[PDB]
């Protein structure tokens, strides 16, 4: 089971199954263990009041690719079914079952979140019977518990070529915030006059469904496709008709030009790719941790990914820094179009930014802990991060000047950069304390370290400050126009402290407390702020003991395994590299939790990070202060004989790295 | 396990394990393989458009019994309780959970769809220590996704001699065509100056819990009550205001009147009585067969059982 | 009666009273002859159609400082009070009352608008003893008839450091054009531990309450303050988050950082002044207006001032 391309998993067993995902940025369809089912199936976007936090989330949707399945009136069960097989394609997000029904037939069905259609889902079922057969096939649409007010219907579109059959439901968010269409239909390919009759029955109040039989000869593959499009108020005015218009739209496309279309989307970005020669299983898990943010990101958008992408319901689908310092750097090498449509996110929401700034009593943008539509703090209010925890407002300073720095694009930095660059460095002006001895002080905050709350001058966040603050001045500099000469100032003078050790001390009341995740040693990377090796090295020692086993992100040991690496520490950087994921891994696609053993995946936060251990900390590859991408020195794994990352930088540079 | 008047079993299995009910034939209470948890709670008369058939049903309803436990900070589950029994009494309609947590504590629950009061469940939960510990109660009201435009209130009704903590929500079933109301309180032996300080959460859309700590040292026994009041507008007119009534009114009364009234009404079904000798699985089953149709139907009502009665959602609990 | 940075007023007329107003250009605070009590809250671009002129208006808010305050019992009124005062120093808006009951106890109170903090409001109370004295304090969330739809909730945020109790309403203005959300905590300086334990009481369908007793030796001064959150849908999507994220966010601040940061910004204003030497009654007057021109606008807004600024609903809250 280790296809550098491929996840697959052999009789699923339903009692210890962590689901895969297929998406496309905009949809994620989350597998089942059971034949022709999906778990989950995730809009981005949409948000309402749900569940977790008191504040709004994402919202299970309809599982539309539902389907059953009889031979001569007998559903396809567990019971009656062998060699049942799932597989994750990764080099196009394609998740096929396959099985025999009992001796008498073989069924495959593949399913896709269009890549090139955000809108557009496809299933493929294909039928093999060693003697003639009828199907019975039922799609169902089963309004979820999480909507309301659900409408089911059903019509043909026809002309004298087509009869396209709608399976079509509207539904709300529970206050009504949004409104949901899907809608449904078969693709045959004998043709109008041999199709065969759909029928249509409504028969629960949250739940219909579209239904044929068709006669299969002996040793003959029978073929059909359900499109589904799955679209909001969000996303549009008028859902109900826009979905019936794309699944229409998708029919008279066809099953051949969707797919050759989805095939070109995904070939493309896999021509950014990271192989390793010695080791199949980094392969493959290396090659899972792009697909899962290749799938749960877009470009030529405004989109931003979630903790766990489009994987659930993780963190109610809120954007955090995990976006900016976590899952946005291996993204900006690797495809810099997905990087500008992360920072967008954060462009379109500098007014709610500025609103949050004023509500609080600072100047210029302070962002949101937690974003989601609107760009307003979304935090559950029974935790702390979403009051205290401000770094939020650096790190997007931060991913916007890297932006620059990786792209060029003046045009740009003037037009979308500069305006973040200038509103955060208004905040952290405002926000620091001039103390007696003429240092800036930042107090009262929760700690990057979120198990240190309401304590003074947080390492991390006095580094975000510093460097928002710098980044906006040279902004200013590049822009040709004048920066409060303020910002350096309090840049050169807020404190970073040590303890009696020469340790860099995490917070003013930080003695040896254990921490959540990485904080002090964030200020070697990816800060920068500490590049003296003896200090990265004491800083190191005396934190990385510090995180407990339990109940600490995946936030921590790639930047560990980074920073050994950069000390030229193969045997640490290789320790913690394989720390940072393998302890948190669920079966049986090794999807990513958040913590050691840890039941709630895809953590795609925990993946960017191990994406940067990889690209920037095995590769050495490292963003310029200067601008562009560099190479520093660097160690490989003993056991990886070759290290190749594709298409890095504007240039689309090859690296290759041997021992 | 053929004892003529309890149905018992050991160490409940979540994977295979189909829930016996306690009812009084307006609220049926089905029992979860989970510790201090129910699986499902019906209230009979209350129907709505849902799921199965397009057509009216009985709606799940707030599980308005579920607890957590924890002690010295560690939450109980199935995987860290040993020798974890249930037993249903039949001649009370008692449902018991009984486990040891560690080298801490023996923890006994029984609940009651109380007899007398048709819209009133209690349940008594004992704590015997083997060591000092500290126990965190939490009681929560989760809005089951069945019910909308939930409302999660809590507040103190007080005198000079009690603070009774109403933890209360109000919900509509899926049209609007009923409000339901339920409304939860802690019963305490040890009075208003010495009981535990409530506190209270409304940290979800769906979901609120009352709790409170209590310090209990090694060889005592600690013993609270939770009773909850279930009712909606095809029972009463205003049946916000009737649950916080209802609840005040069973707490004023408190754990032995409730428990006595209660009986007596139990005493008075099993007087009429099928007994069996020579066949003590036979008897068993009968006893079984009786107590769940005097379970299933009430007295000086204009109710009727569906196929199921009480034990959950079967045939949309329609009178056939 | 002519301080040239402070209006007082000598035992308040009801009968001949016009309130002062205490405002940070967001929210304006009128006062109350009656102690412990404002007339009016108003909050800035929050308009709805409602009574004069048949076109949007301001909306009178929640009176959210409305306290009563007990002395063994014993309710603290205009009538049973002596040496009852009130004063506006323009130097920080803060609008203070000070009185004593009886025998028993001087009582201060004083509130502000925080000037940094444009949706939230703080009163500080001292209660300094003449004899051992038991005081209840309430603070009531009443919603005024303006207002419809409302909610009443209550909430302890809770860590190992710290329990804030959340008195939270969320209503809507007349049409449903904008949701109003408001939200209290009392900060008190003893901890966690030995802090009142808060009661929370929902009896009318307009407004429920906060409350406590301390018990107070002679001779002893007792302070705590009310933190007050009122925000909108005109202000920020979602109100009712907002105000209990305020609040908390307030609370983990304290008294005397909020009232440091609130100097700063006062002082800042008064960095333009006006200074007459020789006509102290043109001193006093000439502040007035700085002050209320300074309490009515807010720097680095789009607001406008209205013809009455945050005095209340003249001329509709409209710009001209």
Same mark, same amino acid.
């Given at each position: 089971?280790?296809?550098?391309?491929?996840?697959?998993?052999?009789?699923?067993?339903?009692?210890?199954?962590?689901?895969?995902?297929?998406?496309?940025?905009?949809?994620?369809?989350?597998?089942?263990?059971?034949?022709?089912?999906?778990?989950?199936?995730?809009?981005?976007?949409?948000?309402?009041?749900?569940?977790?936090?008191?504040?709004?989330?994402? =919202?299970?949707?309809? !599982? &539309? %690719?539902?389907?059953?399945?009889?031979? +001569?009136?007998?559903?396809?069960?567990?019971? *009656? $079914?062998?060699?049942?097989?799932?597989?994750?394609?990764?080099?196009?997000?394609?998740?096929?079952?396959?099985?025999?029904?009992?001796?008498?037939?073989?069924?495959?069905?593949?399913?896709?979140?269009?890549?090139?259609?955000?809108?557009?889902?496809?299933?493929?079922?294909?039928?093999?019977?060693?003697?003639?057969?009828? =199907?019975?096939?039922? !799609? &169902? %649409?089963?309004?979820?518990?999480?909507? +309301?007010?659900?409408?089911?219907?059903?019509? *043909? $579109?026809?002309?004298?070529?087509?009869?396209?059959?709608?399976?079509?439901?509207?539904?709300?968010?529970?206050?009504?915030?949004?409104?949901?269409?899907?809608?449904?239909?078969?693709?045959?390919?004998?043709?109008?006059?041999?199709?065969?009759?759909?029928?249509?029955?409504?028969?629960?109040?949250?739940?219909?469904?579209?239904?044929?039989?068709?006669?299969?000869?002996?040793?003959?593959?029978?073929?059909?496709?359900?499109?589904?499009?799955?679209?909001?108020?969000?996303?549009?005015?008028?859902?109900?008709?826009?979905?019936?218009?794309?699944?229409?739209?998708?029919?008279?496309?066809?099953?051949?030009?969707?797919?050759?279309?989805?095939?070109?989307?995904?070939?493309?970005?896999?021509?950014?790719?990271?192989?390793?020669?010695?080791?199949?299983?980094?392969?493959?898990?290396?090659?899972?941790?792009?697909?899962?943010?290749?799938?749960?990101?877009?470009?030529?958008?405004?989109?931003?990914?979630?903790?766990?992408?489009?994987?659930?319901?993780?963190?109610?689908?809120?954007?955090?820094?995990?976006?900016?310092?976590?899952?946005?750097?291996?993204?900006?090498?690797?495809?810099?179009?997905?990087?500008?449509?992360?920072?967008?996110?954060?462009?379109?929401?500098?007014?709610?930014?500025?609103?949050?700034?004023?509500?609080?009593?600072?100047?210029?943008?302070?962002?949101?802990?937690?974003?989601?539509?609107?760009?307003?703090?979304?935090?559950?209010?029974?935790?702390?991060?979403?009051?205290?925890?401000?770094?939020?407002?650096?790190?997007?300073?931060?991913?916007?000047?890297?932006?620059?720095?990786?792209?060029?694009?003046?045009?740009?930095?003037?037009?979308?950069?500069?305006?973040?660059?200038?509103?955060?460095?208004?905040?952290?002006?405002?926000?620091?304390?001039?103390?007696?001895?003429?240092?800036?002080?930042?107090?009262?905050?929760?700690?990057?370290?979120?198990?240190?709350?309401?304590?003074?001058?947080?390492?991390?966040?006095?580094?975000?400050?510093?460097?928002?603050?710098?980044?906006?001045?040279?902004?200013?500099?590049?822009?040709?126009?004048?920066?409060?000469?303020?910002?350096?100032?309090?840049?050169?003078?807020?404190?970073?402290?040590?303890?009696?050790?020469?340790?860099?001390?995490?917070?003013?009341?930080?003695?040896?407390?254990?921490?959540?995740?990485?904080?002090?040693?964030?200020?070697?990377?990816?800060?920068?702020?500490?590049?003296?090796?003896?200090?990265?090295?004491?800083?190191?020692?005396?934190?990385?003991?510090?995180?407990?086993?339990?109940?600490?992100?995946?936030?921590?040991?790639?930047?560990?395994?980074?920073?050994?690496?950069?000390?030229?520490?193969?045997?640490?950087?290789?320790?913690?590299?394989?720390?940072?994921?393998?302890?948190?891994?669920?079966?049986?696609?090794?999807?990513?939790?958040?913590?050691?053993?840890?039941?709630?995946?895809?953590?795609?936060?925990?993946?960017?990070?191990?994406?940067?251990?990889?690209?920037?900390?095995?590769?050495?590859?490292?963003?310029?202060?200067?601008?562009?991408?560099?190479?520093?020195?660097?160690?490989?794994?003993?056991?990886?004989?070759?290290?190749?990352?594709?298409?890095?930088?504007?240039?689309?540079?090859?690296?290759?790295?041997?021992?």
């Amino acid at each position: 089971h280790q296809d550098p391309w491929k996840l697959s998993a052999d009789k699923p067993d339903s009692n210890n199954y962590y689901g895969e995902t297929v998406a496309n940025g905009m949809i994620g369809i989350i597998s089942s263990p059971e034949p022709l089912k999906v778990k989950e199936v995730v809009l981005a976007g949409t948000y309402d009041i749900y569940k977790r936090g008191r504040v709004s989330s994402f =919202i299970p949707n309809y !599982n &539309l %690719l539902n389907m059953k399945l009889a031979f +001569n009136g007998e559903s396809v069960q567990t019971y *009656n $079914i062998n060699n049942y097989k799932q597989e994750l394609d990764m080099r196009n997000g394609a998740f096929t079952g396959s099985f025999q029904f009992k001796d008498l037939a073989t069924v495959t069905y593949s399913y896709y979140a269009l890549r090139h259609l955000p809108h557009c889902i496809m299933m493929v079922v294909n039928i093999n019977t060693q003697k003639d057969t009828e =199907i019975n096939v039922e !799609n &169902l %649409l089963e309004t979820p518990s999480s909507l +309301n007010n659900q409408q089911n219907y059903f019509q *043909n $579109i026809t002309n004298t070529h087509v009869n396209i059959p709608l399976l079509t439901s509207v539904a709300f968010t529970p206050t009504g915030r949004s409104k949901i269409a899907v809608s449904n239909t078969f693709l045959f390919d004998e043709g109008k006059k041999l199709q065969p009759e759909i029928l249509h029955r409504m028969n629960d109040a949250d739940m219909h469904a579209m239904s044929f039989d068709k006669k299969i000869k002996a040793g003959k593959t029978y073929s059909f496709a359900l499109i589904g499009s799955l679209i909001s108020s969000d996303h549009i005015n008028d859902p109900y008709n826009e979905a019936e218009r794309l699944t229409i739209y998708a029919a008279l496309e066809g099953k051949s030009r969707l797919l050759n279309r989805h095939m070109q989307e995904w070939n493309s970005l896999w021509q950014s790719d990271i192989q390793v020669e010695g080791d199949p299983q980094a392969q493959q898990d290396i090659r899972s941790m792009l697909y899962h943010l290749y799938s749960f990101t877009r470009k030529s958008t405004s989109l931003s990914p979630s903790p766990m992408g489009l994987s659930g319901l993780g963190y109610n689908g809120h954007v955090f820094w995990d976006t900016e310092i976590w899952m946005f750097p291996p993204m900006l090498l690797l495809h810099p179009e997905i990087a500008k449509s992360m920072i967008e996110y954060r462009y379109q929401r500098l007014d709610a930014a500025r609103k949050k700034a004023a509500i609080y009593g600072y100047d210029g943008a302070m962002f949101p802990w937690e974003s989601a539509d609107s760009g307003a703090e979304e935090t559950p209010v029974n935790a702390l991060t979403g009051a205290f925890e401000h770094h939020v407002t650096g790190d997007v300073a931060i991913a916007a000047w890297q932006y620059y720095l990786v792209t060029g694009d003046k045009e740009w930095l003037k037009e979308k950069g500069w305006p973040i660059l200038k509103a955060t460095a208004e905040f952290w002006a405002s926000r620091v304390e001039k103390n007696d001895k003429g240092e800036y002080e930042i107090k009262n905050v929760v700690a990057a370290d979120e198990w240190a709350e309401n304590i003074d001058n947080n390492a991390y966040t006095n580094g975000t400050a510093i460097r928002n603050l710098q980044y906006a001045s040279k902004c200013a500099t590049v822009l040709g126009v004048i920066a409060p000469k303020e910002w350096t100032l309090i840049a050169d003078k807020i404190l970073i402290s040590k303890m009696s050790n020469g340790v860099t001390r995490e917070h003013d009341s930080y003695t040896d407390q254990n921490i959540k995740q990485a904080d002090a040693n964030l200020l070697a990377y990816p800060l920068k702020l500490i590049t003296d090796k003896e200090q990265i090295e004491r800083d190191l020692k005396y934190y990385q003991t510090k995180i407990p086993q339990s109940d600490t992100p995946a936030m921590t040991q790639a930047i560990f395994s980074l920073l050994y690496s950069r000390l030229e520490d193969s045997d640490q950087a290789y320790h913690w590299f394989k720390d940072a994921y393998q302890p948190n891994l669920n079966p049986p696609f090794r999807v990513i939790s958040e913590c050691k053993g840890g039941t709630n995946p895809y953590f795609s936060t925990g993946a960017g990070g191990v994406l940067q251990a990889v690209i920037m900390g095995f590769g050495g590859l490292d963003i310029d202060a200067a601008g562009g991408i560099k190479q520093v020195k660097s160690v490989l794994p003993k056991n990886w004989k070759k290290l190749t990352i594709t298409g890095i930088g504007i240039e689309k540079k090859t690296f290759v790295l041997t021992h």
